Amino acid sequence: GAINLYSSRHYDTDQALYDSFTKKTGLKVNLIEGKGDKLIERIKSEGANSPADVFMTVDAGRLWRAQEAGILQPISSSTLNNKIPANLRSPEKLWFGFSKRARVIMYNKNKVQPSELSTYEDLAQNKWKGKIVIRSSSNIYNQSLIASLIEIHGMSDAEGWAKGFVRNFARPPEGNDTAQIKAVAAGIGDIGLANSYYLARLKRSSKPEDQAVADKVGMFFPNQNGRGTHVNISGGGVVKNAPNKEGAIKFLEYLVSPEAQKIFSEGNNEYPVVAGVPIASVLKPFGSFKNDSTNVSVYGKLNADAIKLMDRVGWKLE
């Protein structure tokens, strides 16, 4: 009568989702939390004795690592496949996206007009020297973005890009995504890269100071006239030895319902994955944007190459 959810992605507001699921299915949700890579290690080590039914985390790169650890089993569901865009789920049906984030250009509104922005590729141009802030190469979001660039350009051309990008750093990578947004607002950089939901989070904060930062920083969705913006996922899958496989599948299917999509996405100011679900009020002012159709599993497949490239060009680790 229960499922065991091992998640790094729980927010307090998600209790509404678990309670609705229980009303609809009869199944309790037992929550086990941890950091994503630690949960993968925990499930792998628990092995055939693991009680885990569902694993959830952020970033297709981490979901790929879970898949490679052998802790997931494939699921074939008409509901999951029809409702989740193909680009946002594993080609092998091992994991699935349930909310979406974009890795965007954050820009100082005083110093940068959006007409000056275009693509990720343009960020390697000399005009940005001394102007870019971004976090360390240890961060999965950055690894996944670089992986996408290696997929497009190949290692040689991507290395040339990365050499110019790193040359443009205003300071050594320092702090998290929110720290980059604050540095852009403060004039330490004119532009930075961060996930969309971090600006939204500031635009909603209980702290007035957070609203002041948010008002100074715009969000630009790159590559609109070409392949589209780099998107990534919060997602999950059914665990290999799930004691309640049937219940685990019911939970994933419930997550694509319109009501669950709203609660889950809005809990972290992310976009829904399901077509037709209304967008959070905080995200509407930024407008819709073209998403790249690349399958997000590529981000994991080329994660090791991204790490190698980052080291080669001297993009500092945390």
Ligand SMILES: N[C@H](CCC(=O)O)C(=O)O
């Ligand atoms: N950075 C948070 C944490 C969740 C995670 O790191 O798994 C998020 O984007 O939801």
Ligand SMILES: [Fe+3]
């Ligand atoms: Fe995050």
